[PDB]
Design a protein around this ligand. Structure first.
Ligand SMILES: C[C@]12CC[C@H](O)C[C@@]1(O)CC[C@@H]1[C@@H]2CC[C@]2(C)[C@@H](c3ccc(=O)oc3)C[C@H]3O[C@]132
Lengths: 208, 210
């Protein structure tokens, strides 16, 4: 009934083996699907271990009781996308959460930039402050807004690009939204960034 | 075998969602005919089916609000989802299942947004401090907006971010470009924003101190 996939993000190098685990919460119609960017999900494996038509032999499914595994033996770029296990033996029919296969590269620290609200925006009673984290790896990054050294929360939103096809990096924007009244209440605006490529956290800031 | 979803791209909170799957190359009086949705974040939810005989199955999570019907004379089947919230925002897929195998043929999917907001064009604000510049494309509805730089002459170093749905119910995104810091004092940078749904087109010079 519950289907647990591990991991949810799976880095791999092209030509290496990738393995995706799927555990069912009880005890055979177990399938694997792939959704590549810009297309619908596609059936890879049926009845635990059987390859569907048109599916390359580098894809194989296996599994004991409750433990199921999809192996991709020599990953190609066309294999990048989101993989899902699925059980259709018992109602309700359930998918696992999905494992995104992405490309390994060396750790790359973000270049961090802060952008104050424009004068054009301030005249309409809203203030948006934007922190850019540029061209980093891995995807995992923490951004913290500080306003006069007071840690902010609930009032920022993050957006992240898909992995870059040329350099395998990510980029991330974080936007702190305030009213113009609350923007003018404080002076120092800073975003503090924590990431594997930074030996300690980087802070970028300005004065209103 | 081809499946194709149709229906509105948008509905308001509490209203009914009603979608259609048109099937060709096969008869819906054979096999299993399913509805599946993908949330933002790439979680998939199996919703239910109507079978070859007309018998249905519904996921208990949706059982109160869901109805799957068909018209064999048109080779169509239908999804009705009552009382929608902002958490029914998803891509909706119809899919055939072949007994013993799985979901072998899928439609292209249809993006549904749940929102009480009306069509509104964006405000375009400059982001100014290798150096970075950008534009904050703010408070628009619906998606999409397209952004380009220097009339599409500048593509390298550009990152246009996925839109985020704000607590107000309007979209916002940022588009940024990284450039040589030496070129800041000698060159100019304009973002070109297009919002076809509201007929809005805006060009914004991103000027800086240098
Ligand atoms: C076609 C199918 C699709 C999903 C998987 O690929 C397995 C499957 O191919 C075969 C199995 C099939 C499944 C769809 C759901 C089922 C019809 C379900 C069921 C529901 C009501 C009932 O009265 O009896 C059984 C439980 C299991 O028999 C199911």
């Amino acid at each position: 009934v519950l289907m647990t996939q591990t991991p949810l993000s799976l880095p791999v190098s092209l030509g290496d083996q990738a393995s995706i685990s799927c555990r069912s919460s009880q005890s055979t119609y177990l399938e694997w699907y792939l959704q590549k960017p810009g297309q619908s999900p596609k059936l890879l494996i049926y009845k635990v271990s059987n390859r569907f038509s048109g599916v390359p032999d580098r894809f194989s499914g296996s599994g004991s009781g409750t433990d199921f595994t999809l192996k991709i033996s020599r990953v190609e770029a066309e294999d990048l996308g989101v993989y899902y296990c699925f059980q259709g033996s018992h109602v309700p029919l359930t998918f696992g959460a999905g494992t995104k296969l992405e490309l390994k590269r060396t750790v790359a620290a973000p270049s961090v930039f802060i952008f104050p609200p424009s004068d054009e925006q301030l005249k309409s009673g809203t203030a948006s402050v934007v922190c850019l984290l540029n061209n980093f790896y891995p995807r995992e990054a923490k951004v913290q807004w500080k306003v006069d050294n007071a840690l902010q929360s609930g009032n920022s939103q993050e957006s992240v690009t898909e992995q870059d096809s040329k350099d395998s990096t990510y980029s991330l924007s974080s936007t702190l939204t305030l009213s113009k009244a609350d923007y003018e209440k404080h002076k120092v605006y800073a975003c503090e960034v924590t990431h594997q490529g930074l030996s300690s956290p980087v802070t970028k800031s300005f004065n209103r | 075998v081809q499946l194709q979803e149709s229906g509105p791209s948008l509905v308001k909170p509490s209203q009914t969602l009603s979608l259609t799957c048109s099937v060709t190359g096969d008869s819906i009086t054979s096999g299993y005919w399913n509805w599946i949705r993908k949330f933002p974040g790439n979680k998939l939810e199996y919703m239910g089916y109507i079978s070859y005989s007309g018998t249905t199955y519904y996921n208990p999570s949706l059982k109160s609000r869901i109805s799957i019907t068909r018209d064999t004379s048109k080779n169509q089947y239908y999804l009705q989802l009552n009382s929608v919230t902002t958490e029914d925002t998803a891509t909706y897929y119809c899919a055939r299942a072949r007994y013993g195998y799985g979901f072998d043929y899928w439609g292209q999917g249809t993006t549904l947004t749940v929102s009480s907001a009306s069509t509104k064009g964006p405000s375009v604000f400059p982001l100014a401090p290798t150096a970075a510049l950008g534009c904050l494309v703010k408070d628009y509805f619906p998606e999409p907006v397209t952004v380009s730089w220097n009339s599409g002459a500048l593509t390298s170093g550009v990152h246009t971010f996925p839109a985020v749905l704000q607590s107000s119910g309007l979209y916002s995104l940022s588009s940024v470009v990284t450039v040589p810091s030496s070129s800041l004092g000698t060159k100019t940078y304009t973002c070109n924003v297009d919002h076809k749904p509201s007929n809005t087109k805006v060009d914004k010079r991103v000027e800086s101190k240098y």
